[PDB]
């Protein structure tokens, strides 16, 4: 149980927090999406337990890529803020599969 996950988890729930305030192009997604990550952020937190849930992570992976391609579409509008946060998930999301690609 290294802990870096908290870095992925905390860094993930953050982009989600700095995003719910800069959401644009569908004030209805800010919610539907909140459930997409909430379920994921929980997976990462569950990655430290077995410090290797490559079997439980590849699961939210789809839910993870479901948000990355979702908010990215919200960048259509005054969401120039997401452009700064939406850029996180890209590396952040691929950052977890990296703590397991060991």
Distance CA 9, CA 22 (A): 20
DSSP string, 30-93: HHHHHHHHHHHHHHHHHHHHTT--HHHHHHHHHHHHHHHHHHHHHTSSS-TTHHHHHHHHHHHH
Structure tokens at 69: 């391609």
Answer for the pair 89, 33: CB distance below 8 angstroms, yes or no: no
Distance CA 26, CA 74 (A): 7
Domains in the chain, please, with CATH? 1-102 (1.20.1480.30)
Experimental technique of record:
NMR
Structure tokens at 41: 């952020």
Distance CA 49, CA 36 (A): 21
């Amino acid at each position: 149980m290294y802990g870096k996950l908290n870095d992925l988890l905390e860094d993930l729930q953050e982009v989600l927090k700095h995003v719910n305030q800069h959401w644009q192009g569908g004030q209805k997604n800010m919610n539907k999406v909140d459930h997409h990550l909430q379920n994921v952020i929980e997976d990462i937190h569950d990655f430290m337990q077995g410090g290797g849930s490559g079997g439980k992570l590849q699961e939210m992976m789809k839910e993870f890529q479901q948000v990355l391609d979702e908010i990215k579409q919200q960048l259509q509008g005054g969401d120039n803020s997401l452009h700064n946060v939406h850029e996180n998930i890209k590396e952040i999301f691929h950052h977890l599969e990296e703590l397991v690609h060991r």
